[PDB]
């Protein structure tokens, strides 16, 4: 039996909030990117460092520790870019038109243009951020969504579904607490979860681009980032 199912809603919220990984910084050189090499270099370096924090964040998501090591590996391999991306979108909320990869690294469309097949993904990311902003997505909701992504994306057993159910309860708990009517509750829940479809889409497209960058062999990938990427072939 898993302790995750025995938590109250508040206990779930508190656990997820305190498990939140920090906001990492990029290199402190003032030259705004442009060119594939410098942009993809900074992003890859950043993603590589975030992954180490994601792994330890994942261990603190209730129910994740109960999975076998192999299952934990599978879920992280499947979900890693989705998780990086929803984090990026979350951070970029209060900077319309901008993607805050790091506090010292904000990109817009025009820099995405300087990498082939990149502006498309940038626009999708920016659109998701605007969507978050117009929905007034809250921090408590965000960490719930992010953990759902971790447990859901690679699931296709009943433990995970039971934990997924409890996160649903938690989301409803937050909306009811925020004063939403019963109709506003299920409507908002649906709106939040449908965005995960688009996040999955953006991840798949991103993965294809990273595979292309991999074959180009100009931007260096870490062995770890390499193995996460390899897991999608």
């Amino acid at each position: 039996n898993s302790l995750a199912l025995s938590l109250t809603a508040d206990q779930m919220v508190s656990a997820l909030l305190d498990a939140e990984p920090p906001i990492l910084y990029s290199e402190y050189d003032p030259t705004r990117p442009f060119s594939e090499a410098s942009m993809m270099g900074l992003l890859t370096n950043l993603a590589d460092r975030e992954l180490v924090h994601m792994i330890n964040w994942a261990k603190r998501v209730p129910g994740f520790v109960d999975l076998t090591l192999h299952d934990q590996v599978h879920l992280l391999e499947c979900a890693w870019l989705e998780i990086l991306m929803i984090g990026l979108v979350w951070r970029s909320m209060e900077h319309p038109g901008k993607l805050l990869f790091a506090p010292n690294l904000l990109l817009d469309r025009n820099q995405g243009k300087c990498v082939e097949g990149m502006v498309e993904i940038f626009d999708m990311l920016l659109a998701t951020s605007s969507r978050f902003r117009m929905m007034n997505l809250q921090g408590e909701e965000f960490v719930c969504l992010k953990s759902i992504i971790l447990l859901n994306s690679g699931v296709y057993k009943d433990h995970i579904h039971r934990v997924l159910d409890k996160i649903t309860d938690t989301l409803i708990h937050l909306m009811a607490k925020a004063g939403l009517t019963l109709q506003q509750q299920h409507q908002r829940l649906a709106q939040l979860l449908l965005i995960l479809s688009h996040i999955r889409h953006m991840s798949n497209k991103g993965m294809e681009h990273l595979y292309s960058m991999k074959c180009k062999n100009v931007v260096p990938l870490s062995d770890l980032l390499l193995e996460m990427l390899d897991a999608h072939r």
Partner: peptide, 10 residues
């Protein structure tokens, strides 16, 4: 054989 395997059991 996998870095992820190593990092997860820490």
């Amino acid at each position: 054989h996998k870095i992820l395997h190593r990092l997860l059991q820490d």
